[PDB]
Amino acid sequence: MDIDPYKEFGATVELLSFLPSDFFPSVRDLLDTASALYREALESPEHCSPHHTALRQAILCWGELMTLATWVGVNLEDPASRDLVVSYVNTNMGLKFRQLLWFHISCLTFGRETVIEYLVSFGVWIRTPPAYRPPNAPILSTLP
Amino acid sequence: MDIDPYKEFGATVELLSFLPSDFFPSVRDLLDTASALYREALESPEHCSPHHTALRQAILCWGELMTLATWVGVNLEDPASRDLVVSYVNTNMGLKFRQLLWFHISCLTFGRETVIEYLVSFGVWIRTPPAYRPPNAPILSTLP
Amino acid sequence: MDIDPYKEFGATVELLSFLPSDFFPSVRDLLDTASALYREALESPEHCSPHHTALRQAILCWGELMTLATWVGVNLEDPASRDLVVSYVNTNMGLKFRQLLWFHISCLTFGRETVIEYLVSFGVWIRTPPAYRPPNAPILSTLPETTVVR
Amino acid sequence: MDIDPYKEFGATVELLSFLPSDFFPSVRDLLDTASALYREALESPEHCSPHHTALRQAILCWGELMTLATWVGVNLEDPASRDLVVSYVNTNMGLKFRQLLWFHISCLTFGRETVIEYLVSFGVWIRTPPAYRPPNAPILSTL
């Protein structure tokens, strides 16, 4: 099964490649945001939303990958290759799960429409060469 | 965050551990079942069901886990500890994902309520002595 | 004080005295069954049912017996007498707790009248000699004779 | 399971921890009271009350503990560790059981609300320093 975790909502992994890899907050920051805003809903026994479902599954997935790598890292006595493997983990899995979290937390806080329009506008911005690029980048906000 | 992946569906890790660990089919068999029965819907851009959402996320998680494990095995050089880690990932995470895929596939196929009643019935059955229980193990079936 | 724990529920020990030890699952199996089927209700602050209240007391004192016997065995040093004491408990109090947990779980599941009818019929069966009774005992189950769910 | 035997009624082990361990009467006295006051109700075929149910289960299970401990002490070697076993069983199980019996008898007799208010008031009393602690410790009473 070649599944895209975003088209079920209205995006794709190539619409989120508009945002660089250095754009997405840390997994810690995003988990803290979730615990702050939607912890009751995530711990709830109800299908509050597909975003909640996917976010629960994503959180559990990350916990499981961390468990595995930690158990492996303790077993390993070589720190060189230990940093190698944790860098692989961070880069690949960490980036995809940072996008997954960002997308869902944002679609919950601001809206899927706003999030997709933001992706488009940020693609425009980051495509625009810097000499003609405004400094006031677009940003998701509930304020003027 | 203390999330139960089944509470939003009316079940619990305690209810799915109520069954033996050698009861749940292989993850390969379950992924084949999915590719056969619900591929067109999992690859669809629709919130067809929370079961579909959770199944997509679980498949992606299994993919990430297998990717990491294969990568570290290819970068390692000892089948001994390689078999150690594969046995660990199996016994620990493969069981969770067997439970998850079984739950969701069986739900989509038969019914959430039928699946839960099957869980409790099979648990009571396998816990009851043979001489005082029905002789044939319970089984889910679409055939009347 | 000559109390019967089932008289309050319409049964007696003379009615469950026929069911052999071979009939009741292990205490661990019954406790798991309870934890899975009625844990929300057994940890609930509500008098959900006399069966729930009796079940809560049975689980609490069985744990107490277990603590006692474990501490005793730990303080002992002869594994032979340790086996002897664990056999005494599993034969005397284990059977009684199995009776009790089974009665209450089965009542909650099926029905008091159903469980009592099953006890009557099982007594009829087990009192009957094997040369004259059917070989397959009567059965109390949530399933039909087919064990196939749809 | 994390079962609390007082939660169905409204108390907890934190609320009864207010009362010390030296407060609860002996199991003999409590069973004497239980007999005298509710023998015909505990021996009856009726769910007269959840307190009655719990009290029945409690008396039978205490008897099961007593049979076990008697058999063990008979099989044991020396009075030293025999009395050590007696001390342990008392300290732990007898304490828990007289807690339970006291709670249920006192409720059945005076009122669950009365018993909870009594626990609160006794906590107040036992937390009060002795210089300002009345000697008239709280007590459950009808008249």
From Swiss-Prot, chain D:
Biological processes per GO annotation: microtubule-dependent intracellular transport of viral material towards nucleus; symbiont entry into host cell; viral penetration into host nucleus
Biological function: Self assembles to form an icosahedral capsid. Most capsids appear to be large particles with an icosahedral symmetry of T=4 and consist of 240 copies of capsid protein, though a fraction forms smaller T=3 particles consisting of 180 capsid proteins. Entering capsids are transported along microtubules to the nucleus. Phosphorylation of the capsid is thought to induce exposure of nuclear localization signal in the C-terminal portion of the capsid protein that allows binding to the nuclear pore complex via the importin (karyopherin-) alpha and beta.
Subcellular location: Virion; Host cytoplasm
PTM characteristics: Phosphorylated by host SRPK1, SRPK2, and maybe protein kinase C or GAPDH. Phosphorylation is critical for pregenomic RNA packaging. Protein kinase C phosphorylation is stimulated by HBx protein and may play a role in transport of the viral genome to the nucleus at the late step during the viral replication cycle.
Keyword Transmembrane belongs to the record: no
GO molecular-function terms, A-Z: DNA binding; RNA binding; structural molecule activity
Organism: Hepatitis B virus genotype D subtype ayw (isolate France/Tiollais/1979) (HBV-D)
Principal localisation: virion
Gene this chain is encoded by: C
Known outcome of mutating A80I: In strain: Latvia
Keyword RNA-binding on entry: yes
Subunit details: Homodimerizes, then multimerizes. Interacts with cytosol exposed regions of viral L glycoprotein present in the reticulum-to-Golgi compartment. Interacts with human FLNB. Phosphorylated form interacts with host importin alpha; this interaction depends on the exposure of the NLS, which itself depends upon genome maturation and/or phosphorylation of the capsid protein. Interacts with host NUP153.
Keywords of the record: Capsid protein, Cytoplasmic inwards viral transport, DNA-binding, Host cytoplasm, Host-virus interaction, Microtubular inwards viral transport, Phosphoprotein, Repeat, RNA-binding, T=4 icosahedral capsid protein, Viral penetration into host nucleus, Virion, Virus entry into host cell
GO CC list: host cell; host cell cytoplasm; T=4 icosahedral viral capsid
Family membership noted in the UniProt record: Belongs to the orthohepadnavirus core antigen family.
Protein name: Capsid protein
